Amino acid sequence: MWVYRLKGTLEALDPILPGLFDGGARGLWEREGEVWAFFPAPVDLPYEGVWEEVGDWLEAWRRDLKPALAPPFVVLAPWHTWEGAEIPLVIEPGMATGHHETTRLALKALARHLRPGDKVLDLGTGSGVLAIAAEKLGGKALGVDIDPMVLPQAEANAKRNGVRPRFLEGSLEAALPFGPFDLLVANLYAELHAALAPRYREALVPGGRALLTGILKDRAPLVREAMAGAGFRPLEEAAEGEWVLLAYGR
């Protein structure tokens, strides 16, 4: 990763800016009078600035990391331990963990809604945290992610927890041969929830439930309209900070 420094501001170099995201840049940053453009690979940009090295801000996170409580669970890093009666969820921190509101809302919602023996679909599994949580609760879990890179860590997470979800690459359609399901849990944008609503009804048995998070307070109406439209009935909402969880029965 290499930074690229430019002779101006985000509003004085406003028409050379598109050409930078054709160069592969991931992001732009304004300084005391400089635009810093970061790249995964260096190419021959015509604007004649200057290139710098890779180099702090990764470990300030990993090492300040306190266990995250989400009764009945506590989410712990491989290097933590726990005194309490909580169910420990050990998760190697990195590509999505346990400390975000949305994960906590979904973990508490699993505990309220999941019956031992239920088939669970965890959509956008990332770390496998919710699929793993579900297995700890006696559910039979499939976690899917459209990014096949996360899958091996999801597996490693599951093995440190003594559980065996199934993990597959894909989204709803790839889960279909393994279903139907009793419960769907999904940490995803409001806009995605709203698009997928009909297919959610398809993935669930009659009387099945959907637990939906990743939803911003202000964007919840999108999901409510879509879910009602797909024939679901509202069970309850839960909120923390900017985020809500929405629960539905088909």
């Binding site: 028409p15 050379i16 598109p18 054709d22 991931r26 992001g27 015509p46 801000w57 944008y189 911003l216």
Partner: protein, 139 residues
């Protein structure tokens, strides 16, 4: 009544922010919650897509933050008419495509509460006078 210690200006692709730079250094400096911003940024820009999005983070003395999402660059929205390959260069001697005087009659109302202009009049002449540095035409 909550002290600001940083207004960080930053251009980022819709729904594709990560802890990685610019974000890491830009927020880590002021003790802003990084994972928190990535997750909140991404959900906020999920309705657009692939759009470049300028974003302002206001960081407080308690290490709180808010952020305001912008419009995005006039130049991005111009070549949403003829977006073929890489743009021009630094002096300005490259061709790409072209348009005419009835793109602004839609996109200048979108890019309105940025460079302040109450009247509709000047809004035309800025976009026409932006369609130059990339290799664009208006007739």
């Amino acid at each position: 009544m909550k002290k600001v210690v940083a207004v960080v200006k930053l251009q980022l692709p819709a729904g594709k922010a990560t802890p990685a730079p610019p974000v890491g250094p830009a927020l880590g400096q002021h003790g802003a919650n990084i994972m928190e911003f990535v997750k909140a940024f991404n959900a906020a820009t999920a309705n657009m897509g692939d759009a470049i999005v300028p974003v302002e983070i206001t960081i407080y003395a308690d290490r709180s933050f808010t952020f305001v999402t912008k419009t995005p660059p006039a130049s991005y929205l111009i070549r949403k008419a003829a977006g073929l390959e890489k743009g021009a260069h630094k002096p300005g001697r490259e061709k790409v495509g072209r348009i005419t005087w009835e793109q602004v009659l839609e996109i200048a109302k979108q890019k309105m509460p940025d460079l302040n202009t109450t009247d509709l009049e000047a809004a035309a002449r800025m976009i026409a006078g932006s369609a130059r540095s990339m290799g664009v035409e208006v007739v």
